[PDB]
Design a protein that fits this description.
part of a larger assembly, 2 chains, A: 115 residues, mainly alpha, Chlorophyll a-b binding protein, B: 85 residues, little secondary structure, Single alpha-helices involved in coiled-coils or other helix-helix interfaces, rod-shaped
């Protein structure tokens, strides 16, 4: 719905993707390079973000299949309050921007750090 | 129906080129298998040095910066300005 209910999760949610775009390095895209070693890519050889289907399906419905009821658990298995959190909604928005809107991994100095 | 061939195996079954000598694909990796750099290892040298460059893809040319140094042989030119040193 909800409302109000859909912030905490949004909180945790973007947090990891935001977490992607900071603790990274990175390494592709590419673009600009070359876009698409380990084995090569080992990465299957080409086009495989459809495990996401299953996977990004497998967490959100698997979250909510919850709901405490949770069923989804199941039988067995052995085959100002928008003011606060919602300003917090902004300052997390934001530092996607500067953590993206220039390169971070600068690594421009200053000195050197490894090297 | 035939009896005859079956419009002939080594021409029907002509995907004996899903094996053949098809290092037309395969062995385009195992020549880059050893790829460089310098080449190889050392000197000249594992970045950076790089960021930047031989190979990546991309793109993009490439050059750049004389090849070097015209200038920066201290400064350049030269024997070696002059210019004044």
């Amino acid at each position: 719905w909800l409302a109000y209910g859909e912030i905490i999760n949004g909180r945790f949610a973007m947090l990891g993707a935001a977490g992607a775009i900071a603790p990274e390095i990175l390494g592709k895209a590419g673009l600009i390079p070359a876009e698409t070693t380990y084995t090569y890519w080992a990465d299957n050889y080409t086009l495989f973000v459809l495990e996401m289907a299953l996977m990004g399906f497998a967490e959100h419905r698997r979250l909510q299949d919850w709901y405490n009821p949770g069923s989804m658990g199941k039988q067995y298995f052995l085959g100002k309050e928008v003011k606060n959190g919602r300003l917090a909604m902004l300052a997390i928005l934001g530092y996607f921007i500067q953590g993206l809107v220039t390169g971070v991994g600068p690594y421009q100095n200053l000195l050197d750090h490894l090297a | 129906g035939v009896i005859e061939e079956y419009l002939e195996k080594s021409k029907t079954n002509k995907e004996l080129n899903d094996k053949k000598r098809l290092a037309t694909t395969g062995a385009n990796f195992a020549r880059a298998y050893t790829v460089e750099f310098g080449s190889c290892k050392f000197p000249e040298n594992f970045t950076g040095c790089q960021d930047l460059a031989k190979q990546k893809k991309v793109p993009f040319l490439s050059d750049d910066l004389d090849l070097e140094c015209e200038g920066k042989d201290k400064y350049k030119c030269g024997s070696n300005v002059f210019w004044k040193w």
